[PDB]
Amino acid sequence: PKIVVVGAVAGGATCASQIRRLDKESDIIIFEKDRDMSFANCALPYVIGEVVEDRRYALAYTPEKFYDRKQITVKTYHEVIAINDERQTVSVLNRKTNEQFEESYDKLILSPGASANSLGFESDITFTLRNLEDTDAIDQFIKANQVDKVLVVGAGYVSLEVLENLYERGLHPTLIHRSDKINKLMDADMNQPILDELDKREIPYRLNEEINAINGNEITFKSGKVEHYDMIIEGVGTHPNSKFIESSNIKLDRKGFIPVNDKFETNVPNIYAIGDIATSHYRHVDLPASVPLAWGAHRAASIVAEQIAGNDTIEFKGFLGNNIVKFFDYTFASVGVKPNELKQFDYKMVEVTQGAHANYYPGNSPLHLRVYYDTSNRQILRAAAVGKEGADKRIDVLSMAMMNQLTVDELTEFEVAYAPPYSHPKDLINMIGYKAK
Amino acid sequence: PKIVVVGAVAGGATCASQIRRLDKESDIIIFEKDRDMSFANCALPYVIGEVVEDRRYALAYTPEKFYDRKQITVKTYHEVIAINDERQTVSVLNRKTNEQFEESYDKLILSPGASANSLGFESDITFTLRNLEDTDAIDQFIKANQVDKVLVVGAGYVSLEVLENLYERGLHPTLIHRSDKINKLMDADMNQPILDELDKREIPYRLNEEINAINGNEITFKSGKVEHYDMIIEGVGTHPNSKFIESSNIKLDRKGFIPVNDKFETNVPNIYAIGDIATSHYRHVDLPASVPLAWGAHRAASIVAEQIAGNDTIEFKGFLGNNIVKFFDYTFASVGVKPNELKQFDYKMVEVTQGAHANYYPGNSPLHLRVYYDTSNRQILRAAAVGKEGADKRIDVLSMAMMNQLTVDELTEFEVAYAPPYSHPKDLINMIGYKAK
Ligand SMILES: Cc1cc2nc3c(=O)[nH]c(=O)nc-3n(C[C@H](O)[C@H](O)[C@H](O)COP(=O)(O)OP(=O)(O)OC[C@H]3O[C@@H](n4cnc5c(N)ncnc54)[C@H](O)[C@@H]3O)c2cc1C
Ligand SMILES: Cc1cc2nc3c(=O)[nH]c(=O)nc-3n(C[C@H](O)[C@H](O)[C@H](O)COP(=O)(O)OP(=O)(O)OC[C@H]3O[C@@H](n4cnc5c(N)ncnc54)[C@H](O)[C@@H]3O)c2cc1C
Ligand SMILES: *SCCNC(=O)CCNC(=O)[C@H](O)C(C)(C)COP(=O)(O)OP(=O)(O)OC[C@H]1O[C@@H](n2cnc3c(N)ncnc32)[C@H](O)[C@@H]1OP(=O)(O)O
Ligand SMILES: *SCCNC(=O)CCNC(=O)[C@H](O)C(C)(C)COP(=O)(O)OP(=O)(O)OC[C@H]1O[C@@H](n2cnc3c(N)ncnc32)[C@H](O)[C@@H]1OP(=O)(O)O
Ligand SMILES: [Cl-]
Ligand SMILES: [Cl-]
Ligand SMILES: [Cl-]
Ligand SMILES: [Cl-]
Ligand SMILES: [Cl-]
Ligand SMILES: [Cl-]
Ligand SMILES: [Mg+2]
Ligand SMILES: [Mg+2]
């Protein structure tokens, strides 16, 4: 079938590539509104920090190389501006020539993702971070203006990674956030290490703070403070790239996302949606879920490739919401329903803080593991871990437990790999099970 | 019930402690034939390497402290020499006075573990490692003789840990092993990094080599080589501490171990056996299993505590055999049936070698993950991972998957915690799943 894909990055280029692995005959075309396809979204903060300096790690292909390798046509600077689903075409604006045209399709795959929100100030020193064009602009601005002081707005994982990277590059960032609710995917009382790491390095921060006015490099704040900054990076959330979908028959929810079934199909025949734009449900509980992360973009890309050109019996089984972020020496990871979703259940919480490995063994650091479970059936609802070591290991094990409908009590049965450098004979995970009841 | 425990370490002291958590009225007494209770068995190689300096780290309790905190009586230098099972008493030899006496019991818990084997040479420079007395003797001998060249016999994981520690302490070890099957719980081809690490540090080793004769410090080998050594640490296997059990009604297998049911009961009423002395079965396949490691001693300790003083519906579900060892920069971990047991199944092998984390993120290294599955039902039979980073995480996740007899195909559904420093959007575990078709 003739396949058209909208968006040429985590979900889109991946999906197109997976289809080509299975189907060598179909024509596949991807439209991407911006300059680059296949940029490494998750590498961007590290490119800014000069941790990742080889351009080949910043993006995988150019349209020419993608065509040579996979016979997939990718048109960059081409923005889809409407989906004419009844005639099975999309309307595309060639941004280089400013002319539009219709492209027909047998199957349409939507992976437009999200755009960064902006505070809306008229400021030449302010930047958001979403793609490689943004990354290049930020790097160039730092060099052209000999940037030293940078204001980082927002406290989600993107902003935190950007702050760490600016610091490692040798700049002097200050972090502000409109409330005290930083790194929201993690339990609010488990984020203190973020503030401790800032303090330890004397990196200034102010919570319940916002930009009030900008006059050149003079920034006036809500708190009444006035400071001079060379650059501002705003990480104040994202919004779905779905305005171009509104006039079509595709069903969107009130927040602008696309609900899909387990085959990643929209309500319209032959049109699929994957990636950040799509909403589905949790795997372990009967609740809606939206998890705008890379694992989901890649998993959905594979499922849609099977639906179109492979085993169409392969279907999604829902999200668990596994997520993680590094901030200086600490790791913050969680899986399951969000803190705000726990109230939909009668639940109990159990937790343990213990060394990541043998207490007598060097380089140890306390790991805090917390697990929430449903009192009606003892099923695990959510888990969170924070520590300098071993949090990723504990959360991935709990993600596998939740996939298998394990009860909190059965965690005493988990057989950990034990030697002094790695865990304890009764691992933190086993202790959660023993402490449950 | 009056409870008598034989052995005051990983299984025994733990079990007595777990019973006390549930029952504050029963009298509990533990007999330990040697000097110390609750020594840190797994810390011993590190104590020899001076990685663990504070000897307080190698001993968790003394009998006086155990009585003060848990009201449990522990008699060290007291060796149980016979079990008079029909009258429900044990005969105990007070090793300080050489006088024996009987101790009655309502429940008897055997956790005598295993003793180190010896090659049998008449040599004052040869030592074995099993407890803190041994560790003290080795340390004392190194200092008294200014030991430099040391022969480490045996290539099992503990001997390897001893070798690494002797090297880091500043001594010059040479490793020999009677066969080429080093670190036997790991796939043979995946153990090459052990030899690479030895070679990188110019630490000599000879496989399929054995001691022929010992004449003072002059050691003659099977190969015909003659070398002078200041000390020899023999890691030539262990044997069960069951000679004192032979006269009783307890059933022992041909190797001297005690087969137990899922309540860790022996064939004799009121007598339980846990730890290295006990044999059971695998959880995921119908085959016998013996896994003489710490996790099993602690898990059995809790199950026996529930049987005696808690919820008697709690029973063991079998072993998976999760194990791991660190050797210099590498980690070697495996779970499931042993290499030699794979022949009892019709199976296939799938493997991937990929970066432990994002390829562009610093300090990456190649992680080799291998999974064996049963062709009759797609169930995972065994998994092994070797690498400088991430092997423990992948093997613990697979242990959790096996606990639930998960299939190899379902690994595509595992939702990993992804950020650049930790994994990939399609993790190594997911890739095993994608490569299994
Ligand atoms: C700085 C940063 C760090 C991140 N870190 C992590 C992390 O560590 N771990 C993690 O799991 N996730 C991380 N993410 C999230 C991850 O990048 C997204 O979940 C993933 O990119 C979503 O894939 P997608 O295809 O939906 O969107 P994207 O990969 O963003 O691709 C969307 C594409 O479609 C294009 N598009 C939109 N509308 C149109 C249109 N009308 N016509 C043509 N093209 C269009 C856009 O220009 C864009 O190139 C990070 C994201 C960023 C920006
Ligand atoms: C150097 C070393 C390193 C190790 N490293 C690891 C590792 O990294 N990971 C891992 O999982 N496992 C490791 N182990 C294995 C682990 O220590 C054992 O699996 C665990 O100790 C078994 O518990 P147990 O109670 O059966 O035996 P033990 O803990 O050995 O205790 C047995 C006790 O009973 C006593 N006893 C025996 N007979 C009698 C008697 N007749 N009367 C009175 N007392 C008696 C013995 O003196 C001994 O103190 C290691 C062991 C050693 C020695
Ligand atoms: S923010 C974190 C996520 N970031 C991104 O996704 C960045 C944008 N990504 C993309 O644009 C696409 O993901 C690109 C880079 C275009 C390619 O996507 P694929 O996932 O399909 O990758 P490749 O085609 O490059 O495959 C490379 C290696 O993986 C093996 N492989 C892919 N798919 C499969 C399946 N289904 N089964 C088995 N193996 C599979 C390939 O064989 C290949 O290994 P090599 O070592 O290259 O031979
Ligand atoms: S080679 C590796 C194996 N070697 C060894 O284990 C060495 C010898 N071991 C022992 O002698 C025992 O394992 C000792 C050191 C006596 C410990 O026995 P327990 O396992 O029973 O532990 P503690 O009573 O000392 O408890 C320490 C902490 O764990 C919590 N805990 C234990 N058991 C439970 C159960 N069933 N449920 C909830 N919590 C449990 C304790 O409350 C305690 O926590 P703290 O806040 O640190 O007091
Ligand atoms: Cl990336
Ligand atoms: Cl239309
Ligand atoms: Cl705790
Ligand atoms: Cl220990
Ligand atoms: Cl008798
Ligand atoms: Cl039996
Ligand atoms: Mg129309
Ligand atoms: Mg504590």
Instruction: Please give the full DSSP string across B312-350, using - where no structure is assigned.
Output: TT-----B---EEEEETTEEEEEEES-GGGGGGS-EEEE
**CB nearest A422 (choices: B51, B324, B419):** B324
Q: CB within 8 A of A25, min separation 6: which ones?
A: none
Are A426 and B298 in contact, with CB atoms under 8 Å apart? yes
Angstrom distance (rounded) from CA A60 to CA B35? 63
User: From its phi and psi, is residue A271 left (phi > 0), alpha (psi between -120 and 50) or beta?
Assistant: beta
Protein residue whose Cα sits closest to atom 28 of ligand 1: A113
Angstrom distance (rounded) from CA A37 to CA A29? 12
Angstrom distance (rounded) from CA A304 to CA A6? 14
Q: Of the candidates A55, A69, A60, A2, which has an alpha carbon nearest to the alpha carbon of residue A29?
A: A2
Which residues are paired to B371 by β-bridges? B350, B383
Q: Of the candidates B311, B302, B292, B297, which has an alpha carbon nearest to the alpha carbon of residue B17?
A: B302
- Looking at chain B, how many residues does it have? 437
Other Cβ atoms less than 10 A from the Cβ of B167: the count is 19
First-last CA distance in chain B? 56
Burial class (CB in 10 A: 0-12, 13-18, 19+), B69: exposed
- Looking at chain A, how many residues does it have? 437
Q: CB within 8 A of B77, min separation 6: which ones?
A: B32, B33, B34, B35, B94, B95, B96
Q: How far off is chain A from B125, nearest CA to CA, in Å?
A: 28
- How big is the CA angle at B96 (ends B91 and B100), to the nearest 5 degrees? 20
Other Cβ atoms less than 10 A from the Cβ of B328: the count is 18
Burial class (CB in 10 A: 0-12, 13-18, 19+), A62: middle
Other Cβ atoms less than 10 A from the Cβ of A274: the count is 32
Q: By three-state DSSP, how is residue A325 classified?
A: strand
**CB nearest B324 (choices: A297, A333, A417):** A417
Other Cβ atoms less than 10 A from the Cβ of A229: the count is 21
Angstrom distance (rounded) from CA A109 to CA B311? 54
First-last CA distance in chain A? 55
Instruction: Please give the full DSSP string across A259-323, using - where no structure is assigned.
Output: E--TT-B-SSTTEEE-GGGEEEEBSSSSSEE---SHHHHHHHHHHHHHHHHS-TT-----B---E
Q: Which residues of A touch B43 (CB under 8 A)?
A: 358, 360-361, 420
What's the half-sphere exposure (Cβ side, CA atoms, 13 Å) at A360?
Answer: 22
What six digits make up the tokens of B199? 């070679």
Angstrom distance (rounded) from CA A198 to CA B113? 49
| Cβ burial A75-84 (10 Å sphere, 16+ → b, else e) | bbebbbebbe
Q: Of the candidates B387, B367, B393, which has an alpha carbon nearest to the alpha carbon of residue A389?
A: B393
What six digits make up the tokens of B78? 């007291």
Q: At what angle do helices A391-403 and B391-403 cross, to 10 degrees?
A: 20
Angstrom distance (rounded) from CA A397 to CA A384? 12
Tell the residue number behind the tokens 């049998």, with chain if given. Answer: B120
Instruction: Please give the full DSSP string across A179-192, using - where no structure is assigned.
Output: SS--STTS-GGG-H
The alpha carbons of chain B give a radius of gyration, in whole angstroms, of: 23
Are A376 and A363 in contact, with CB atoms under 8 Å apart? no
Name the amino acid, one letter, at B76.
Answer: T
What is the 3-state composition of chain A as percent helix, strand, coil, each rounded to the nearest 5?
A: 30, 30, 40
Do the Cβ atoms of B425 and A10 come within 8 Å?
Answer: yes
Residue from B6, B39, B42, B201 carrying the catalytic annotation: B42
How far, in Å, is the centroid of ligand 5 from the Cα of A43?
5
- How big is the CA angle at B252 (ends B249 and B256), to the nearest 5 degrees? 135
Helix (H) or strand (E) run with residue A215 in it:
strand A211-215
Which residues are paired to B150 by β-bridges? B173, B231
What six digits make up the tokens of A416? 């950990």
List the domains of chain A with CATH numbers: 1-33+60-113+240-322 (3.50.50.60), 41-58+114-238 (3.50.50.60), 330-437 (3.30.390.30)
Distances (CA, A) of A238 to A159, A170, A277, B429: 12, 28, 11, 30
Instruction: Please give the full DSSP string across B37-80, using - where no structure is assigned.
Output: SSB-GGGHHHHHTTSS--GGGGB---HHHHHHHH--EEETTEEE
Angstrom distance (rounded) from CA B437 to CA B422? 26
What six digits make up the tokens of A163? 């702050």
What six digits make up the tokens of B140? 């004392």
How far, in Å, is the centroid of ligand 6 from the Cα of A87?
5
Method: X-ray
Q: At what angle do helices B63-70 and B12-22 cross, to 10 degrees?
A: 20
Q: Give the residue numbers of A marked as catalytic.
A: 42
Q: How are beta strands B258-259 and B278-281 bridged, if at all?
A: parallel
Angstrom distance (rounded) from CA B233 to CA B118? 10
Burial class (CB in 10 A: 0-12, 13-18, 19+), A117: middle
Are A367 and A356 in contact, with CB atoms under 8 Å apart? yes
Determine if ligand 2 sits within 6 Å of the CB of residue B32: yes
Q: Of the candidates B216, B227, B117, which has an alpha carbon nearest to the alpha carbon of residue B174?
A: B227
Are B361 and B421 in contact, with CB atoms under 8 Å apart? yes
Which residues are paired to B324 by β-bridges? B333
Q: How are beta strands A271-273 and A366-374 bridged, if at all?
A: unpaired
How far, in Å, is the centroid of ligand 4 from the Cα of B165?
27
Other Cβ atoms less than 10 A from the Cβ of A422: the count is 26
Angstrom distance (rounded) from CA B373 to CA B375? 6
Q: How far off is chain B from A360, nearest CA to CA, in Å?
A: 5
Angstrom distance (rounded) from CA A310 to CA A302? 10
Q: Of the candidates B314, B316, B301, B261, which has an alpha carbon nearest to the alpha carbon of residue B20?
A: B301
Ligand lying closest to the C-alpha of residue A15: 3
Backbone angles phi, psi at B355, to 5 degrees: -60, 145
Angstrom distance (rounded) from CA B188 to CA B417? 31
Reported structure resolution in angstroms = 1.5
Angstrom distance (rounded) from CA A24 to CA A172? 51
Other Cβ atoms less than 10 A from the Cβ of B434: the count is 16
Angstrom distance (rounded) from CA A299 to CA B413? 8
Other Cβ atoms less than 10 A from the Cβ of A113: the count is 24
Q: CB within 8 A of A42, min separation 6: which ones?
A: A294, B358, B418, B419, B420
Backbone angles phi, psi at A149, to 5 degrees: -90, 120
Tell the residue number behind the tokens 């920034």, with chain if given. Answer: A219
Q: By three-state DSSP, how is residue A375 classified?
A: coil
Q: CB within 8 A of B311, min separation 6: which ones?
A: none
Q: At what angle do helices A391-403 and A428-435 cross, to 10 degrees?
A: 60
Q: By three-state DSSP, how is residue A242 classified?
A: coil
Ligand lying closest to the C-alpha of residue A31: 1
Are B348 and B376 in contact, with CB atoms under 8 Å apart? no
Angstrom distance (rounded) from CA B416 to CA B293? 28
| Cβ burial B42-57 (10 Å sphere, 16+ → b, else e) | bbbbbbbbebbeeeeb
Q: How far off is chain B from A226, nearest CA to CA, in Å?
A: 35
State whether the Cα torsion A298-A304-A306-A310 is positive or negative. negative
Burial class (CB in 10 A: 0-12, 13-18, 19+), B268: middle
Are A100 and A91 in contact, with CB atoms under 8 Å apart? yes
Q: By three-state DSSP, how is residue A47 classified?
A: helix
Protein residue whose Cα sits closest to atom 35 of ligand 1: A7
Angstrom distance (rounded) from CA B180 to CA B160? 14
Are B113 and B277 in contact, with CB atoms under 8 Å apart? yes
Distance, CA of B127 to chain centre:
19
Tell the residue number behind the tokens 């901030």, with chain if given. Answer: A327
Which residues are paired to A288 by β-bridges? A281
Angstrom distance (rounded) from CA B34 to CA B186? 33
Backbone angles phi, psi at A351, to 5 degrees: -150, 160
Helix (H) or strand (E) run with residue A104 in it:
strand A99-104
Determine if ligand 3 sits within 6 Å of the CB of residue A90: no
Angstrom distance (rounded) from CA B420 to CA A324? 10
Q: Of the candidates A388, A391, A394, A389, which has an alpha carbon nearest to the alpha carbon of residue A330?
A: A388
Q: In this complex, how many residue pairs, one in chain A and one in chain B, have their CB atoms less than 8 Å apart? A: 185
Ligand 2 atom index nearest CA of B14: 25
Distance, CA of B338 to chain centre:
15
Following CA atoms A213, A214, A220, A222 in sequence, which dihedral angle do they give, to the nearest 10 degrees?
30
Angstrom distance (rounded) from CA B142 to CA B49? 11
What six digits make up the tokens of B50? 């001076």
Distances (CA, A) of B78 to A254, A403, A410, B18, B297: 75, 49, 37, 22, 21
Angstrom distance (rounded) from CA B278 to CA A248? 68
User: From its phi and psi, is residue B243 left (phi > 0), alpha (psi between -120 and 50) or beta?
Assistant: alpha
Q: Of the candidates B72, B85, B58, B76, which has an alpha carbon nearest to the alpha carbon of residue B21?
A: B72
